[PDB]
Amino acid sequence: QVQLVESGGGLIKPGGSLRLSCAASGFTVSYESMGWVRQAPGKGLEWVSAISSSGGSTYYADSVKGRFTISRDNSKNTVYLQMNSLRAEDTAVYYCVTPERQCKQSTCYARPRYWGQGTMVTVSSASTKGPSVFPLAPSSKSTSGGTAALGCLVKDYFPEPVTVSWNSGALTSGVHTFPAVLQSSGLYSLSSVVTVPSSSLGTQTYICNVNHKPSNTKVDKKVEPK
Amino acid sequence: QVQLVESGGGLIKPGGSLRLSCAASGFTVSYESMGWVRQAPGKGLEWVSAISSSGGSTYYADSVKGRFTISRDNSKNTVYLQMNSLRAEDTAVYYCVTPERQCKQSTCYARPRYWGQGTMVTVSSASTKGPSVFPLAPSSKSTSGGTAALGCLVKDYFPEPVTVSWNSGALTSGVHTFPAVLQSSGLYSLSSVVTVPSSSLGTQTYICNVNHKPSNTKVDKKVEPK
Amino acid sequence: EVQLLESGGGLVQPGGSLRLSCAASGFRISDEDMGWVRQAPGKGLEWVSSIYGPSGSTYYADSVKGRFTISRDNSKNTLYLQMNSLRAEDTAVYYCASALEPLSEPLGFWGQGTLVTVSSGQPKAAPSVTLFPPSSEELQANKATLVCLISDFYPGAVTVAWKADSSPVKAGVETTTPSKQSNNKYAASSYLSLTPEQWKSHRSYSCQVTHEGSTVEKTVAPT
Amino acid sequence: EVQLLESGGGLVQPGGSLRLSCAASGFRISDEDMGWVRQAPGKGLEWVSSIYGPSGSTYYADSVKGRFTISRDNSKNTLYLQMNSLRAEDTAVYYCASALEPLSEPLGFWGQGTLVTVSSGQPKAAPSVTLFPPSSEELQANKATLVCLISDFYPGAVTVAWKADSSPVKAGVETTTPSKQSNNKYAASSYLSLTPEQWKSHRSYSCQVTHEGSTVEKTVAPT
């Protein structure tokens, strides 16, 4: 298990092109078969392409053929994955594993396995957009002890990041501003909850501060009971 | 075991191009992986290229990569093997076998196997040349019974065919004009022996008639004892 | 279609042991050279063990030889991976992987992948779950989103199930992968996109999250 | 380098049986799915049988099922093919073939291929061999060619070995594949290209042809 340096991910719109690569940094790789594995968010792993040691034999997955091209420059200890006409189905994290072959040999058993860090490829037709902030109101059930959780939903913004705070940073105890999710629209969305004493509910007023400077926009939005 | 029609062999000079193909004649092939096997004269079999069922994954042998290209039109039930920059190392008979995969399935076990007839690809830098006829003289040992075998060697002619006879077709009992051999010069060569009563040796005179009409040339050459 | 479903794995203190299972369906594990690969952030996918056909010859990474054991049970069609003397560096998501058969419909086949965690100072933790119905300001804006927020669970692995009334739901489900918190527990979100018609045409909606199999859930209704 | 050397095969009358052997070197026959393919003029290369890994599941062409048997002997590292109840259509050159491992140095591996002949009215036939030294007209023309002519042998399979004095020779050997004669026996030629220096610098040259292992040979010398 020896690491290769992986490069060439990033963001693009559908139909665009990106190139990934893995190279050896300061050493010479024992040339052998190489493959690329990707994992879409929330889904399992899948092989997208493989190339033989000499670089002459190439596999491609059916949802990938024609658009992708694997290659390698053994003089540079580098394998490439040229991706063209990218679609939203290609948004995933791509890895640089070496395949597991039918070995039958003491040379295929103890061959060095090479791995890449894993770069994110994002294919989105969206761009800069301010967020839509919705109040996640407290519930009908408020014990005069504590147990009062309110939040605010930050929907359909682009791109990362967004800074969330409560009452202009006054309130800080107990907030969980969750990581954002990418949805089928290409936009991001997250929410930020606090849990707060219920005796202050109705007397203390809570507003969450939701900055998206990529679009130069905040929202401070109340979370009052219905 | 079901036959495909194979086409596209023949002769060419080094650096040229030829295209082989196998198609289904009157039926639709259950699409699966396909490969090409060749056999150089006097040598064993070897795989030159393979292609997956969908046509997206292609193998190539190392002595073949870059110059050859396998492909398939499943709408036409046809697989192709485009061969470019042909060399003398490519002179062989090419077959259209289906590969034997790691099956693990009741579908890969009883899958229909497809075969091609086997076409000859000849890469020769030679062209029309008359033959050089050498006498294969009888031996020091002649029993007055029979046992006298003489012949004439037909060397370095191009191309096939050559017609051999003895004494202008007078002598016909016991002649074996062997099939021709292709050598590392690109030219053909064969020999034709008769075995003849030894009592006629020294009194009867034998000349073999060696026509190569492709070059418009015969030779009638004696086979006398030394 | 063939499938490889994984079971086993969990939380263990240094020195403990686990056994991962890989249920083979549609084929037998003996003719096919299976292997295990682990996934860790910044470590990519690294092969740790693989079995090579009937001869029983096995490959192990140098860091797991003498501790891990690959094995097949053909009477149960299962690939096993015994993991003894576990250390902190063994913490990763372990995937069941097969031989790669490159001329086939897909190339390789993968298991779902189960989390294996090895730590000492951190105990088990059940997740805190609160479910929010779509806000009135959002439903008045022509769209509806159910927000299920999960926090304070260890180890960092959960699976979320959404259910209209009682039938499981298919589409519009977006759940992030668990993320470490400040108290070194984990958090995760689960959103269910929804058009205002289906929200008002259903008696209830529920977000089932299970951590170590732990069905914790919440139910909301327009009423 | 791994190798697959074939033995067995020969001539048999309808109803007889044979066993072909495939000696595996550099690997074990169990992890690798081997098969047999037969070669006949106008019939190309057709797979007749193949064994699929430890499960012992086997494929047979419809024309050989119930007659042929594929088998592995791992204590001897040999792939066998028993061929019972042979018919005339079974006559072909049978090649030992392995699984195809397409990401490897070569793709597939082949045995040398032994001839299997099934006929009734034709008996065995040893070959007639006559060897001709280079003619004087040819040596005066700066080149030399030894001509070895083989005729009247059945079945149609021979292997020719050329020998300078006693050491086997490498280059300039051109031997045609056997061809059917008028009396339905077979004929073959073997030429040895030679520069006049080596012909006069050697005590003798010999052409060894073996049919059914049958060493028949001739020796010529410049003297």
Numbering used by the authors:
A (entry chain B), B (entry chain B): 1 to 226
C (entry chain A), D (entry chain A): 1 to 223
Question: What does the publication say?
Answer:
Here, we explore the possibility of generating a new bispecific design that aims to address the manufacturing and valency limitations of IgG-like bispecific molecules by leveraging the smallest immunoglobulin-based recognition unit, the VH domain. Recently, Shi et al. proposed a novel antibody format where two such soluble VH domains are used to replace the VH and VL of a traditional IgG through engraftment onto the CH1 and CL domains of each Fab arm. Additionally, since these molecules were symmetrically constructed using autonomous VH domains, no special cognate chain pairing was required. Moreover, the molecules’ symmetry, with each half containing two specificities, gives rise to bivalency while retaining a nearly normal IgG structure.
One of the best performing single VH domains, Gr3, showed greater than 90% monomeric purity by SEC, high Tms indictive of thermostability and a sub-nM binding affinity for its target, Her2. While these nine phage- and HcAb transgenic mouse-derived VH domains showed stable interactions with their target antigen, characterized by nM or sub-nM KDs, two domains, 3D3 targeting Luks PV and HEL4 targeting lysozyme, were unable to bind their targets. For example, IgGs and Fabs with transgenic mouse-derived 1F3 in the VH1 position or the phage-derived Hel4 and DOM1h-131-203 in the VH2 position showed yields greater than 25 mg/L and over 90% purity. More specifically, with its framework tryptophan no longer surface exposed, HEL4 may display a more attractive interaction interface for other VH domains including Gr3. This observation suggests that although VH domains grafted onto the IgG scaffold do not chain pair as do traditional VH and VL domains, paired VH domains do interact, as shown in Figure 6, and the VH–VH interface plays an important stabilizing role for the molecule. However, the VH:VH dimer alone (in absence of CH1/CL) shows good alignment with VH:VL Fv domains (root mean square deviation, R.M.S.D, of structures tested = ~1–2 Å), indicating that while the orientations of the domains differ, the structure of the domains themselves do not.
